[PDB]
Write a protein that binds this ligand. Structure first.
Ligand code: FMN
Ligand code: FMN
Ligand code: LRO
Ligand code: LRO
Lengths: 313, 313
C-alpha cells in the first residue's frame, strides 16, 4: 500500500504538503520541505516587493492551536519565481507558488510573469484571497464582488489552471454565494479550505496580556480550534464545486485528522500549525498513521473514501 | 473579595449565568437554574408558537466542545412570559428572557407584550440576532441592513433597555460595521458575544459519519474550540461600544476562562457547553476558581480588572 495520487496533471507520492506560510519562506525552508516526505510543497504567499511583516512576537502556539499576525513577511515575488524557475527540483515533488498581492493589479502583474514558468516547469499557482486589514472594507473573499473581480482579472492574465486559498465561511448562504462565484471560473481547478479563522484573541491569564504584539493581539487561529470549521468548509465546497478539486487545510495533527479531511472531500491535505510545532518529520508519521487507518478499514486507495462522509438519513 | 455586580439596575451575586438554550427550556430547567448558585439565568430563545425543533440527534459533545442544530425547539412565548410574570422568584436572582422570532414582525409582537412585564417585574430582554431570516440569506446579524431593521423596530415596539445576542465575527471590517449599527440604538444596553461559531462539521472517524442529523451534519460549535474567537469578539465590542455592557459567552469551562473573558471586558459571563456537560454544579466550581485567581493576584472586585487586558508595546 502506497498513498500515491495524480492530479492537476502532476503525480504526488502522498496527499500531504505544508500549508502556505509554514516552513516555506526562505530558500532554506523550501529545500527542507523538498527533502521531507511530503507529497508536495507551497511557497510563502508573496508580494511584488519584499516585506518584513509585523513586529514580533507575531506567532504563538498552545496545546490547542496557534495564533498569528505575521503581516505577510516574504522575500518578494522575484525570489519565489526564481526558486520555481531555477532551484526547485521537480523530480522530488510538485511545487505550488502562493501569491497574495495587495491589489488586483499587483496580482495580475505577478501572474503574467508566472505563466511561462508554469508552462515550462509545471509550478502550480495558489492565489491567496486573504490580505492585511484596510479600514472600511472586508478581506476580498468576504466581499463577493471584489472576489469575482480578482478572479476575472487573474484568469484573463494567467490563462492556465490555478487554485484559490479561501478563508472559512460560517453561514450556508455564504457557502452558496462563494461557490457560485468560484464556479464562474473554469480555470479555478482547486479550492483550498481553509485559511486561519480570522481575528481570534488569545490572552495569558498570569500576565493578563495578549500574546502577540500586532493588532492589539488579534490574529488568525490555526490548529485544533479549527478542525470542525475546516471540515465543514471542505465538505461545503466539495459538494458545491463538483468540477473542481478541494484541498483541505486546518487542524491536521494526525493521520486520523487527515482521514476526516479526505472523507469530507479533500484531495490534498495541508499542514500548518502542527508542522510549525513538530517540524517536517511530521510527514512520515502522518503517512504511517493514515495508511494504518486505511488498512484497519480495508481501504486500498484514497479514492475509495474521498468525499464519502456519511449523513444520518 | 467579592463577585457582586450591579448593572442594568439589577444586583447579581456573581457574574455567571447559563447561555441561552442550555438548561432553560422547561419550567423544571428554569427552576433548576434558579436553585443553582448562578448569578442570573436566561430562558430558552422563543418563538410566538411552540416548536418541536429538528430531528435527533441534534446536539453532540466531545472533549473539545459541542455541535448543535437544535432548530429552536421551545415552549413558545406565552410560556416564557408566564414564567417571567408569574412563576420566577426574583428575590433569588435576575431573569433574562431571550427571544428569537423568525421575522421582524414576530419579534415586534413578542416585545410589545413583554414590555409591561419587563417594566413591572424587571425581566430583561436578550434579542437573539442569529435568528434565521429569509432562507438563502445570511443570519440576521450577518446582514447589516436586516440587523438595523430589526433593531429599529424592536426599539420602537419595546421602548425599554434590552440586549442583543451576537454571532461571532472574523473580519475587523465586520467588527467595525456591526458595532456602528449597534451604537445607533441607545436602548441596546448590553451585547452578548458570542453565539455558536456557525456551520461547523464534526465527523466521527470510526463510523465515517457526521454526528448530528439535521443540515447533513453542519451545526454551531461551542466550547473549547471557540474561546479565542469569543474573547476576540468580547474585546472588539468592548472597545467599540463604550456606552454598552458586554456579556461574554463561549468556551468557559473554568474560573480562569471566566477571568479571561472579564479581562476582555465581559460583565456577565455565560456558560453553555460546559454547563450542558457538567450540570449546574459547575457554578460553585467556577465561583471558587475565579475567587482563587483573584486572591492570588490581590483583586478584590471584578471592576478592578474588567477590560484591563494588556497589549504589547
Ligand atoms: C505562521 C503562519 C503563516 C501563515 N501564512 C500564510 C500565507 O502566507 N498564506 C496563506 O495562504 N496562509 C497562511 N497561513 C495559513 C495556513 O496556511 C493555514 O490555512 C492555517 O494555519 C490553518 O491550518 P492549520 O490548522 O494547519 O494551522 C499561515 C499560518 C501560520 C500559522
Ligand atoms: C444546545 C444548545 C442550544 C442553544 N440554543 C441557543 C438559543 O436558543 N439562543 C441563543 O442565543 N444561543 C443558543 N445557543 C448558543 C449558546 O447560548 C452559546 O452562545 C454557545 O453555545 C457558545 O457558548 P459555549 O462555548 O459555552 O457553548 C445554544 C447552544 C447549545 C449548545
Ligand atoms: C492580517 C493579515 C495579514 C496578511 C495576510 C495574508 C498572509 C497570511 C498571514 C500572515 O502572513 O499574517 N497569516 C495567515 O494566517 N494567513 C495568511 O493568509 C492575512 C491577514
Ligand atoms: C439553523 C438555526 C436555527 C435556529 C437558530 C437560533 C437558535 C439557536 C440554536 C438552535 O436552536 O439551533 N443553536 C445555537 O447554537 N444558537 C442559536 O441561537 C440558529 C440556527
Amino acid at each position: 500500500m502506497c498513498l500515491k495520487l495524480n492530479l492537476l496533471d502532476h503525480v504526488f507520492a502522498n496527499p500531504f504538503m505544508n500549508a502556505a506560510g509554514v516552513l516555506c519562506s526562505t530558500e532554506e525552508d523550501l529545500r527542507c520541505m523538498t527533502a521531507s516526505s511530503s507529497g508536495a510543497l507551497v511557497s510563502k504567499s508573496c508580494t511584488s516587493a519584499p516585506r518584513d511583516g509585523n513586529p514580533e512576537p507575531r506567532y504563538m502556539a498552545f496545546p490547542l492551536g496557534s495564533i498569528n499576525s505575521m503581516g505577510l513577511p516574504n522575500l518578494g515575488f522575484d525570489f519565489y519565481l526564481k526558486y520555481a524557475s531555477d532551484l526547485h527540483d521537480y523530480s522530488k515533488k510538485p511545487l505550488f507558488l502562493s501569491i497574495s498581492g495587495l491589489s488586483v493589479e499587483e496580482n495580475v502583474a505577478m501572474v503574467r510573469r508566472l505563466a511561462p514558468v508554469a508552462q515550462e516547469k509545471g509550478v502550480l499557482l495558489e492565489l491567496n484571497l486573504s490580505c492585511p486589514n484596510v479600514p472600511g472594507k472586508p478581506q476580498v473573499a468576504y466581499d463577493f464582488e471584489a472576489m469575482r473581480t480578482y478572479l476575472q482579472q487573474v484568469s484573463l492574465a494567467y490563462g492556465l489552471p490555478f487554485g484559490v486559498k479561501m478563508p472559512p465561511y460560517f453561514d450556508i448562504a455564504h457557502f452558496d454565494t462563494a461557490a457560485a462565484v468560484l464556479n464562474e471560473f473554469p480555470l479555478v481547478k482547486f479550492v483550498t479550505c481553509v485559511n486561519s479563522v480570522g481575528n481570534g484573541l488569545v490572552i495569558d491569564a498570569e500576565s493578563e496580556s495578549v500574546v502577540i504584539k500586532p493588532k492589539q493581539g488579534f490574529g488568525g487561529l490555526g490548529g485544533k480550534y479549527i478542525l470542525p470549521t475546516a471540515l465543514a468548509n471542505v465538505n461545503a465546497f466539495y459538494r458545491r464545486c463538483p468540477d473542481k478539486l478541494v484541498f483541505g487545510c486546518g487542524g491536521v495533527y494526525s493521520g486520523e485528522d487527515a482521514f476526516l479531511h479526505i472523507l469530507a472531500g479533500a484531495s490534498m491535505v495541508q499542514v500548518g500549525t502542527a508542522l510549525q510545532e513538530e517540524g517536517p518529520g511530521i510527514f512520515t508519521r502522518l503517512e504511517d498513521e493514515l495508511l494504518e487507518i486505511m488498512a484497519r478499514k480495508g481501504y486500498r486507495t484514497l479514492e475509495e473514501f474521498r468525499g464519502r462522509v456519511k449523513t444520518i438519513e
